[PDB]
Amino acid sequence: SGKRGLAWPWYNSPLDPGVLNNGDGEVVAIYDWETYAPPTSTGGTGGLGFIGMQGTMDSDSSPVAQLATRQAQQGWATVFSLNEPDINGITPAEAASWYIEWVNPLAIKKALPAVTSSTTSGQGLSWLSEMISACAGACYFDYINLHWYGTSFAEFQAYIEQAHNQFPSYTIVISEFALTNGGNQVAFFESAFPFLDGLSYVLLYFPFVATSPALLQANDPGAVTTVGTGSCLYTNAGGPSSVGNLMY
Ligand SMILES: [Cl-]
């Protein structure tokens, strides 16, 4: 059981997820922030298990009325829910009620919404604790879902240990993580992979981001400002980058 997965944007039709699957089983999963199949150069997912994701309450691209049908047609083993509701003006009670209505009926493994690493009350893990209070046992889930961006491996380690200390019986997936712009992304992931591989309560982790610098600059310039291009798992030619090599 590897834990590694691809955070695979909507704009990745040029790239092949199989490039980061060398058959040694470290890379096992792919998600694309949507409920439609990853856009790839191969028509497949390179042997990786696709995890659907209802990242907004409803969108043109992931209409929530189609969430059950898409899961059934595509046979996901796992589904992810809202993307960073903690900073997008969704109340813990609104999320709980939407989650019970729309996600609960998918009879597979389920993740509560991805929250940010914010220490603010009503954001991050505080927002998540308030959503779990609102659910009061009525949200069916398997995982909690973390994001992290910061400036040091030490801060990242402290944050995952803090999440485990708050939710010690919970299983964690890390759907997005990298250093902010200027950090040495290679040194970070070289620390972070063996650390996360050693935690029995972390099931999956997805470096931000399994694309190329050119596609991230073309489609997501805000991400290039925030993270730079050093965390892109792909090269501009579709090969593995210095960070992609760490995935094997
Ligand atoms: Cl974060």
- Burial-class residue 50 by CB neighbours within 10 Å (0-12, 13-18, 19+): buried
Q: Is 131:95 a contact under the CB 8 Å cutoff? A: yes
CB count, 10 Å around CB of 210? Answer: 30
Strand-pair category, 171-179 with 49-53: unpaired
Phi, psi of 139 (to 5 degrees): -75, 120
Question: What's the gap in Å between 235 CA and the centre of ligand 1?
Answer: 25
The SS3 of residue 69 is helix
Calculate the alpha carbon distances from 101 to 65, 173, 245 in Å.
11, 23, 41
Split into its structural domains, the chain has a count of 1
Determine whether 163 is exposed, middle or buried from the number of CB atoms within 10 Å of its CB (0-12, 13-18, 19+): buried
Q: Phi/psi class of residue 23: alpha, beta or left (left: φ > 0; alpha: ψ in -120 to 50)?
A: left
The closest of 145, 164, 155 to 192, measured between CA atoms, is 155
Range of the domain at 100: 1-248
Bridge partners of residue 49, in order along the sequence: 29
Tokens of 8: 């695979």
Q: Are 42 and 13 in contact (CB under 8 A)?
A: no
Q: How far apart are CA 204 and CA 236, in angstroms?
A: 26
- Ligand 1 center–CA 118 separation, angstroms: 6
Calculate the CA dihedral of residues 79, 83, 84, 86 and round it to 10 degrees: -70
Distance of CA 129 to the CA centre of its chain: 19
Distance between first and last Cα of the chain: 13
Q: Is 52 within 8 Å of 71 (Cβ atoms)?
A: yes
Resolution of the experimentally solved model in angstroms: 1.8
Cα–Cα distance list, 110 to 52, 184, 234 (Å): 10, 33, 28
Per the document, the length of the chain is 248
Ligand 1 center to 15 CA (angstroms): 26
State which approach was used to obtain the coordinates. X-ray
Compute the distance from residue 156 Cα to the ligand 1 centre, in Å: 10
Which residues touch 135 (CB under 8 Å, ≥6 apart)?
96, 99, 100
- Sheet strands (E) in the chain: 4-7, 27-31, 49-53, 78-80, 109-115, 143-150, 171-179, 202-205
Token pair for 110: 């389920």
Tokens of 185: 């992304």
User: In the structure encoding, which two tokens stand for residue 117, read together?
Assistant: 């690493």
**C-alpha of residue 181 to centroid of ligand 1, in Å:** 14
Helix crossing, 153-166 with 124-135: angle to 10°?
20
What dihedral angle (degrees, nearest 10) is formed by the CA atoms of 130, 34, 233, 202? 40
Give the separation between CA 123 and CA 52, rounded to whole angstroms: 24
> Ligand 1 centre and the CA of 128: distance in Å?
13
